[PDB]
Design an enzyme around this catalytic site. Structure first.
Site, PDB file in Angstrom:
ATOM      1  NE  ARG A 254      34.296  22.371 -21.366  1.00 55.39           N
ATOM      2  CZ  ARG A 254      35.024  21.418 -20.780  1.00 55.39           C
ATOM      3  NH1 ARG A 254      36.297  21.618 -20.411  1.00 55.39           N
ATOM      4  NH2 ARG A 254      34.475  20.226 -20.588  1.00 55.39           N
TER       5      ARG A 254
ATOM      6  NE  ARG B 120      50.182  20.213 -13.522  1.00 53.05           N
ATOM      7  CZ  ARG B 120      50.616  21.465 -13.650  1.00 53.05           C
ATOM      8  NH1 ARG B 120      50.830  22.237 -12.582  1.00 53.05           N
ATOM      9  NH2 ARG B 120      50.844  21.952 -14.860  1.00 53.05           N
TER      10      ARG B 120
ATOM     11  NE  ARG C 222      36.376   8.873 -15.848  1.00 54.17           N
ATOM     12  CZ  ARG C 222      35.402   8.211 -16.468  1.00 54.17           C
ATOM     13  NH1 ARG C 222      35.510   7.856 -17.752  1.00 54.17           N
ATOM     14  NH2 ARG C 222      34.304   7.889 -15.792  1.00 54.17           N
TER      15      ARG C 222
ATOM     16  CG  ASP D 119      41.209  24.946 -22.440  1.00 53.96           C
ATOM     17  OD1 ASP D 119      41.528  23.912 -23.107  1.00 53.96           O
ATOM     18  OD2 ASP D 119      41.600  25.120 -21.272  1.00 53.96           O
TER      19      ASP D 119
ATOM     20  CG  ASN E  12      44.443  16.454 -19.153  1.00 53.12           C
ATOM     21  OD1 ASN E  12      45.040  17.431 -19.648  1.00 53.12           O
ATOM     22  ND2 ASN E  12      43.123  16.318 -19.199  1.00 53.12           N
TER      23      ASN E  12
ATOM     24  CB  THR F 132      34.747  16.098 -20.477  1.00 55.25           C
ATOM     25  OG1 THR F 132      34.445  17.006 -19.412  1.00 55.25           O
ATOM     26  CG2 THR F 132      34.493  16.785 -21.809  1.00 55.25           C
TER      27      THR F 132
ATOM     28  CG  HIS G  33      44.089  21.641 -21.280  1.00 54.33           C
ATOM     29  ND1 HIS G  33      42.857  22.041 -21.736  1.00 54.33           N
ATOM     30  CD2 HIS G  33      43.881  20.490 -20.599  1.00 54.33           C
ATOM     31  CE1 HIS G  33      41.942  21.175 -21.343  1.00 54.33           C
ATOM     32  NE2 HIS G  33      42.541  20.218 -20.659  1.00 54.33           N
TER      33      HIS G  33
HETATM   34  N1  LIG Z   1      43.145  17.863 -23.155  1.00 55.52           N
HETATM   35  C1  LIG Z   1      41.718  17.914 -23.004  1.00 55.52           C
HETATM   36  O1  LIG Z   1      41.131  18.955 -23.293  1.00 55.52           O
HETATM   37  C2  LIG Z   1      40.944  16.739 -22.494  1.00 55.52           C
HETATM   38  C3  LIG Z   1      39.514  16.818 -22.098  1.00 55.52           C
HETATM   39  C4  LIG Z   1      39.011  15.604 -21.368  1.00 55.52           C
HETATM   40  C5  LIG Z   1      39.879  14.419 -21.085  1.00 55.52           C
HETATM   41  N2  LIG Z   1      41.285  14.530 -21.318  1.00 55.52           N
HETATM   42  C6  LIG Z   1      41.927  13.305 -20.859  1.00 55.52           C
HETATM   43  O2  LIG Z   1      41.750  12.191 -21.690  1.00 55.52           O
HETATM   44  C7  LIG Z   1      42.215  11.050 -20.917  1.00 55.52           C
HETATM   45  C8  LIG Z   1      41.187  10.039 -21.005  1.00 55.52           C
HETATM   46  O3  LIG Z   1      39.964  10.321 -20.418  1.00 55.52           O
HETATM   47  P1  LIG Z   1      38.856   9.218 -20.220  1.00 55.52           P
HETATM   48  O4  LIG Z   1      37.665   9.839 -19.534  1.00 55.52           O
HETATM   49  O5  LIG Z   1      38.469   8.593 -21.552  1.00 55.52           O
HETATM   50  O6  LIG Z   1      39.580   8.124 -19.317  1.00 55.52           O
HETATM   51  P2  LIG Z   1      39.018   6.619 -19.182  1.00 55.52           P
HETATM   52  O7  LIG Z   1      39.519   6.053 -17.885  1.00 55.52           O
HETATM   53  O8  LIG Z   1      37.511   6.571 -19.415  1.00 55.52           O
HETATM   54  O9  LIG Z   1      39.733   5.787 -20.310  1.00 55.52           O
HETATM   55  C9  LIG Z   1      41.078   5.531 -20.399  1.00 55.52           C
HETATM   56  C10 LIG Z   1      41.373   4.401 -21.254  1.00 55.52           C
HETATM   57  O10 LIG Z   1      42.768   4.311 -21.433  1.00 55.52           O
HETATM   58  C11 LIG Z   1      43.033   2.944 -21.338  1.00 55.52           C
HETATM   59  N3  LIG Z   1      44.439   2.650 -21.072  1.00 55.52           N
HETATM   60  C12 LIG Z   1      45.046   2.609 -19.870  1.00 55.52           C
HETATM   61  N4  LIG Z   1      46.344   2.258 -20.029  1.00 55.52           N
HETATM   62  C13 LIG Z   1      46.586   2.052 -21.323  1.00 55.52           C
HETATM   63  C14 LIG Z   1      47.693   1.680 -22.085  1.00 55.52           C
HETATM   64  N5  LIG Z   1      48.973   1.422 -21.468  1.00 55.52           N
HETATM   65  N6  LIG Z   1      47.603   1.563 -23.427  1.00 55.52           N
HETATM   66  C15 LIG Z   1      46.422   1.797 -24.032  1.00 55.52           C
HETATM   67  N7  LIG Z   1      45.339   2.165 -23.352  1.00 55.52           N
HETATM   68  C16 LIG Z   1      45.370   2.295 -21.998  1.00 55.52           C
HETATM   69  C17 LIG Z   1      42.068   2.468 -20.278  1.00 55.52           C
HETATM   70  O11 LIG Z   1      41.965   1.081 -20.197  1.00 55.52           O
HETATM   71  C18 LIG Z   1      40.873   3.120 -20.644  1.00 55.52           C
HETATM   72  O12 LIG Z   1      40.116   2.377 -21.563  1.00 55.52           O
HETATM   73  C19 LIG Z   1      42.462  11.557 -19.535  1.00 55.52           C
HETATM   74  O13 LIG Z   1      43.817  11.835 -19.388  1.00 55.52           O
HETATM   75  C20 LIG Z   1      41.665  12.803 -19.468  1.00 55.52           C
HETATM   76  O14 LIG Z   1      42.105  13.667 -18.540  1.00 55.52           O
HETATM   77  C21 LIG Z   1      41.786  15.682 -21.907  1.00 55.52           C
HETATM   78  O1  LIG Z   2      36.668  19.116 -18.656  1.00 54.35           O
HETATM   79  C1  LIG Z   2      37.700  18.510 -18.441  1.00 54.35           C
HETATM   80  O2  LIG Z   2      37.704  17.384 -17.672  1.00 54.35           O
HETATM   81  C2  LIG Z   2      38.892  17.057 -16.870  1.00 54.35           C
HETATM   82  C3  LIG Z   2      39.261  18.140 -15.843  1.00 54.35           C
HETATM   83  C4  LIG Z   2      40.575  18.280 -15.359  1.00 54.35           C
HETATM   84  C5  LIG Z   2      40.921  19.275 -14.438  1.00 54.35           C
HETATM   85  C6  LIG Z   2      39.948  20.164 -13.977  1.00 54.35           C
HETATM   86  C7  LIG Z   2      38.634  20.046 -14.455  1.00 54.35           C
HETATM   87  C8  LIG Z   2      38.289  19.043 -15.377  1.00 54.35           C
HETATM   88  C9  LIG Z   2      38.547  15.701 -16.248  1.00 54.35           C
HETATM   89  C10 LIG Z   2      38.718  15.446 -14.873  1.00 54.35           C
HETATM   90  C11 LIG Z   2      38.377  14.198 -14.336  1.00 54.35           C
HETATM   91  C12 LIG Z   2      37.834  13.201 -15.165  1.00 54.35           C
HETATM   92  C13 LIG Z   2      37.649  13.434 -16.540  1.00 54.35           C
HETATM   93  C14 LIG Z   2      37.996  14.689 -17.085  1.00 54.35           C
HETATM   94  O3  LIG Z   2      37.816  14.912 -18.431  1.00 54.35           O
HETATM   95  C15 LIG Z   2      40.050  16.932 -17.887  1.00 54.35           C
HETATM   96  C16 LIG Z   2      40.100  18.201 -18.689  1.00 54.35           C
HETATM   97  O4  LIG Z   2      41.298  18.577 -19.150  1.00 54.35           O
HETATM   98  C17 LIG Z   2      38.995  18.946 -18.964  1.00 54.35           C
HETATM   99  S1  LIG Z   2      39.095  20.419 -19.926  1.00 54.35           S
HETATM  100  C18 LIG Z   2      39.324  21.768 -18.758  1.00 54.35           C
HETATM  101  C19 LIG Z   2      39.704  21.505 -17.426  1.00 54.35           C
HETATM  102  C20 LIG Z   2      39.856  22.545 -16.508  1.00 54.35           C
HETATM  103  C21 LIG Z   2      39.648  23.877 -16.875  1.00 54.35           C
HETATM  104  C22 LIG Z   2      39.280  24.162 -18.186  1.00 54.35           C
HETATM  105  C23 LIG Z   2      39.116  23.123 -19.115  1.00 54.35           C
HETATM  106 CL1  LIG Z   2      38.670  23.544 -20.740  1.00 54.35          CL
END
Ligand SMILES: NC(=O)c1ccc[n+]([C@@H]2O[C@H](COP(=O)([O-])OP(=O)(O)OC[C@H]3O[C@@H](n4cnc5c(N)ncnc54)[C@H](O)[C@@H]3O)[C@@H](O)[C@H]2O)c1
Ligand SMILES: O=C1O[C@@](c2ccccc2)(c2ccccc2O)CC(O)=C1Sc1ccccc1Cl
Ligand SMILES: NC(=O)c1ccc[n+]([C@@H]2O[C@H](COP(=O)([O-])OP(=O)(O)OC[C@H]3O[C@@H](n4cnc5c(N)ncnc54)[C@H](O)[C@@H]3O)[C@@H](O)[C@H]2O)c1
Ligand SMILES: NC(=O)c1ccc[n+]([C@@H]2O[C@H](COP(=O)([O-])OP(=O)(O)OC[C@H]3O[C@@H](n4cnc5c(N)ncnc54)[C@H](O)[C@@H]3O)[C@@H](O)[C@H]2O)c1
Ligand SMILES: NC(=O)c1ccc[n+]([C@@H]2O[C@H](COP(=O)([O-])OP(=O)(O)OC[C@H]3O[C@@H](n4cnc5c(N)ncnc54)[C@H](O)[C@@H]3O)[C@@H](O)[C@H]2O)c1
Ligand SMILES: O=C1O[C@@](c2ccccc2)(c2ccccc2O)CC(O)=C1Sc1ccccc1Cl
Ligand SMILES: O=C1O[C@@](c2ccccc2)(c2ccccc2O)CC(O)=C1Sc1ccccc1Cl
Lengths: 325, 327, 323, 324
Positions: B164, B101, B98, B161, B133, B243, B188
């Site tokens: 929420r 950008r 995580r 989004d 992301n 999250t 997003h």
């Molecule tokens: N689109 C959304 O609405 C939403 C909401 C929250 C999180 N996200 C995203 O989800 C992603 C993960 O979040 P997180 O809190 O679980 O991160 P995290 O750091 O807790 O976990 C990431 C995992 O990916 C693994 N990883 C790293 N490189 C890898 C590889 N080459 N192959 C396989 N696995 C690998 C790590 O070892 C780790 O276990 C982030 O990009 C975060 O921003 C998106």
């Molecule tokens: O809730 C989220 O968490 C992250 C985020 C990214 C950018 C800005 C705020 C939060 C995040 C950041 C750091 C570590 C772990 C995370 O999940 C990643 C992520 O996409 C969301 S969803 C979200 C984010 C911003 C606005 C509205 C929404 Cl619905």
């Protein structure tokens, strides 16, 4: 007229007590795993979280709330103040910290938690997950003043689940259809009841009289050893256990909240059984329902098996008599 | 004879293949929440987990296996090698640490360059669900690398989004989020677009009742609901670091529609070239019909001049980043 | 342009072959209870209904379809023609009328080859009575390997038994274990040795368990399993809900590859001194390939003799049938 | 000592009462469809069944009981006496015949309703028996309950059918096809065209002829099909059961779990749309543990209001002549 007043005509404001409320105390990995599993099983109409770490508590609360669209639990609350826990049917305690200090330190935590819980939910059932669970169930019972039926320790519920998983892997059968009971003291001193192990009512011990002994060619004893090695291994590998305990706890919660009267290996006061006469809590199969533990099953144990439970009771009482309330 | 053979008579040992297999790549907080939610919704007959951290991966695998008694997913497997992921219907990518950008993009592109071809090798016919992301850019990236058709590369997009949004709307109205309808679309996160015209309870348009809705002249400041979608997210990160639960629930809902061929409509990220004056290869959230072929159809939402300008602006920025990516 | 085309942009029209399809043949009380139970358990992505009575069949389909909003089974179809059943993973036969057996055999002569033509790799689950014989008939007509022909058998009998045991003990039936094997219905065999709560054997506690001289008359729990079914027919005219729920439990194990153990009817030649091609209930591991394994229950001499007598009786009937 | 005592040590005999009891009155096709759907949804810790036909009641009870292994409702009871229904949270009335139709179900209700109120004075009443809008008024009059605790199934099923048909036409799951059918259950129900939408996109705005005779796609016939398909199903199989059972269980879910989801159910609409008579019609209502706590004030066109008003006058015309 606001938009809300323009859109919605109110017939009554009269809000009621929540009817199926659950509280989780402690929002660490265990507590939150309990929370998510309880939410996905639709067991509560209101969930309350409590912890002493305030930022973490709010964040976990909000994160659950943001999934509300995908759940059927219309109210999720949290707070440091136990007023958020009022009128809970069930209160699950996962809060907790040499290692004889450790007991007294968790006793000290319980001295604060338990009276607050009782004050706001005098009629609740208590489900103790915190370790060492058997001692801490006694502590909760002692501090709360509740009848023994309303203080339940997670006990060997997880132990038995692991055992059935492992048994299932060995036989190539789903754990649901692999029956076997791990009883007594949760953790390293637990007792596998070989006489009860069966598939389809076919006793494994009758087929294989050496089952669970040192003469056993196949060393089924390893399954129980693996039950303890597994838990150490999970800690070594990921740092904690969460998912499996959360699921096993939701299963206990389901029986209580829905008054199912299913039988689970949980920790209850076993005074008067197996030659034990101290106030100690150990796992036996219990019937679980809306008033908690109403009944227990009198498992026929071998002399060796009774002896192991006796030793556990003696060790547990030894620690308990030294504790400060 | 062994105890097993005394107890059990085998009729056949044909080893077949899983019918409803799901893989989750990256067992962090997001990936594991995805996993538990999918397990508790009985969506899969086999769950595979992949990560690069081998001990964490095994421990997580084991911890789920230990709850098998309480689930109806009979096989859970894990490994660093993608052979564990063979014949997945749905592969969910939650990999990458995580979170600037652009540097996030850079490092997650590099991870994807390794992940995506290995996924395709073992599960050529899967649906890919991208959560990592920035999700819109990484959905493009997965589509470019995989060579999959457009329908089979789905980004989580504005699904969270919008959830929420619906939670917050429901809180102000005293109505369950299920009965509060409203769509947050486009990019997003920070630049998402709340479509005021679609917000309704029981087909009753809130904007029609309250024409100032979403404008600066609104005395009840309903525009703060969308702002609070953005603020909520930052606040959860501040409070607990990440999250997990909401995103996991939201992803399991998408998996549900796909695995069970529901053809429900979700705000997810798809290739939007041809809409809203957008002529570049960009992925943004619109409402999409999800089923067993992934995104089979998309809904054409009428947007205001302003709403359309915001999507167009996002598309311009995203394409600006994407055109410089090296494959 | 149409309203649909104005609202929706289509990416592809292509339709896959169904992935998790169930067919129920016979839309009587049993068939429809199986259908509603299957639907509320989210076991299928496509449900097909077949019967010979066309109006009834259409009416049942529509009634279910009108409930679609409350379900997660997106395609529900029906027809007299078995083309509606193409590519079913599981086909459940509930259709039915020495006279009675042969009348059902005649039904099965039409049904089974039609099922096979459109789902040649399906599992068949036979509910129609007398179930043990008709499972044998479906096996013979289909030409399927024995693993893919399963009879509902004693699944319901065991469920009833566990309900009655639970009532007597004050325990949920899920924690009350006990197995009724052999021939479905009147001649079934309660295996007293396996009856237990938490691995504690009732027979070991109470050696009179299952004998006539038992002061608590625990034998009546099995007699009431048979008496229950006659009473329900007397009082309401047919059984439906319990059988529907029991069939859905079997379907769950098959469709989800659970490998749980169920008392179902399987081809038992080679056990218990049985030397004929007969189907009887034993505990079987159920999964994606149907019955992959069975549990070898240790039976008493009297239990064995009851299974053998059923085998002889069933075979005595089966050898007389014309296909 | 019995085997039970040898096996099981009893800690306490403190007997309990159910926390989430539901009663179904009438165990015909509809009642039993409601029951099985409620049972498969885990909404009740106790289910009570009541009917006047004693053998049928016992036999249906037994049949459900026999599937207990596969359920999470630990007690199913039945009886002719309403003491079996005591302390019900929710009581669903499905009894009666499928001018004469009304007065005979009224007479049934003169027996049923006082008996329900006697044993469960704080319950929510959910009326399914036809004509549902009239019998909801009748239940409310006889019970003396506040209007929030007397709910007719109303147009929940009509709207469910509409959404099914809409979904087939659009190739979208009914869950994602939004559309409300309000007013009187049955022939005179009103399709609210202005509310019909997918993903918040108004179909009426995209297609101005929607719901008019000028419509080349004849969407008006979708509402006609909703009105008809009930007759169609009765003609083909003799009755309707499954769809209504599913819809009742959806309402029961919102009530029992305090969900505050919005459903179109029959409620007292006096005070709305110029209606002055004590008539029940379907509008969207927020449903929870106190029954109907709130209703949504749908903005109707003049034609739509006129239609509801006409229904109110008709229903009142029948109701004023009923004798309690
Ligand atoms: N689109 C959304 O609405 C939403 C909401 C929250 C999180 N996200 C995203 O989800 C992603 C993960 O979040 P997180 O809190 O679980 O991160 P995290 O750091 O807790 O976990 C990431 C995992 O990916 C693994 N990883 C790293 N490189 C890898 C590889 N080459 N192959 C396989 N696995 C690998 C790590 O070892 C780790 O276990 C982030 O990009 C975060 O921003 C998106
Ligand atoms: O809730 C989220 O968490 C992250 C985020 C990214 C950018 C800005 C705020 C939060 C995040 C950041 C750091 C570590 C772990 C995370 O999940 C990643 C992520 O996409 C969301 S969803 C979200 C984010 C911003 C606005 C509205 C929404 Cl619905
Ligand atoms: N019985 C079992 O089978 C089972 C299995 C795993 C864990 N446990 C136990 O669960 C407990 C917690 O496990 P964990 O991994 O979540 O630990 P954790 O440290 O991550 O979480 C514990 C939480 O308790 C909180 N806490 C401490 N004192 C508190 C107080 N006075 N009031 C409210 N909250 C307080 C902490 O802030 C922390 O959030 C431990 O005792 C652990 O041993 C037992
Ligand atoms: N194994 C068990 O435990 C269990 C329990 C209950 C009933 N059963 C059996 O289920 C069967 C049916 O029960 P029911 O109460 O639903 O009977 P039913 O008479 O109500 O319905 C049977 C259906 O079979 C249909 N049918 C007849 N011939 C057909 C054909 N050639 N093709 C397709 N459909 C055909 C009929 O039209 C009818 O709709 C009976 O054999 C009954 O004994 C067994
Ligand atoms: N609201 C809807 O959308 C909807 C849909 C289907 C049917 N309905 C109605 O539901 C009602 C029942 O339909 P059905 O098909 O189940 O009828 P049914 O004839 O199969 O069953 C009716 C039951 O009511 C019982 N009953 C009669 N008088 C009684 C009394 N005084 N006390 C207790 N029980 C009594 C009968 O004995 C019978 O068992 C009808 O009014 C029908 O029109 C409404
Ligand atoms: O699995 C568990 O994890 C913990 C544990 C305690 C002692 C030894 C091993 C593990 C743990 C330790 C540290 C941090 C978090 C934890 O959850 C706590 C705990 O009771 C279990 S279950 C268990 C433990 C030992 C043997 C058999 C079983 Cl079934
Ligand atoms: O319960 C059942 O109902 C039927 C039956 C068959 C033979 C004797 C009694 C009942 C029946 C009869 C008529 C109409 C419809 C029916 O379903 C069919 C049937 O197999 C069962 S199960 C059963 C039957 C007898 C003993 C023990 C058990 Cl567990």
């Amino acid at each position: 007229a606001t938009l809300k007043d323009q859109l919605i005509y109110n017939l009554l404001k009269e809000e009621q007590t929540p009817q199926n409320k659950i509280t989780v105390v402690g929002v660490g990995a265990v507590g939150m795993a309990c929370a998510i599993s309880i939410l996905m099983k639709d067991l509560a109409d209101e969930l309350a979280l409590v912890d002493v770490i305030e930022d973490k508590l709010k964040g976990e609360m909000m994160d659950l709330q943001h999934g509300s669209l995908f759940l059927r639990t219309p109210k999720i609350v949290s707070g440091k103040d136990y007023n958020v826990t009022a009128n809970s049917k069930l209160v699950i305690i996962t809060a907790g910290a040499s290692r004889l200090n450790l007991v007294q330190r968790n006793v000290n935590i319980f001295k604060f938690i338990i009276p607050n819980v009782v004050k706001y939910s005098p009629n609740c059932k208590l489900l103790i997950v915190s370790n060492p669970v058997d001692i801490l169930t006694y502590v909760a019972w002692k501090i709360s003043g509740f009848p023994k039926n309303r203080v339940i320790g997670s006990g060997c519920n997880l132990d038995s689940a692991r055992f059935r998983y492992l048994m299932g892997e060995r036989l190539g059968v789903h754990p649901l259809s692999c029956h076997g009971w791990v009883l007594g003291e949760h953790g390293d001193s637990s007792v596998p009841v070989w006489s009860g192990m069966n598939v389809a009512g076919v006793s494994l011990k009758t087929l294989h009289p050496d089952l669970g002994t040192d003469k056993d060619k196949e060393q089924w004893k390893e399954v129980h050893k693996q039950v303890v090695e597994s838990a150490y291994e999970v800690i070594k590998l990921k740092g904690y256990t969460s998912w499996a305990i959360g699921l096993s706890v939701a299963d206990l919660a389901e029986s209580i909240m829905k008054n199912l009267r299913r039988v689970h290996p949980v920790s209850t006061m076993i005074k008067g059984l197996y030659g034990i006469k101290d106030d100690v809590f150990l796992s036996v199969p219990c019937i679980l329902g809306q008033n908690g533990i109403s009944d227990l099953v009198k498992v026929t144990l071998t002399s060796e098996e009774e002896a192991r439970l006796k030793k556990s009771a003696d060790t547990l009482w030894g620690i308990q008599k030294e504790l400060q309330f």
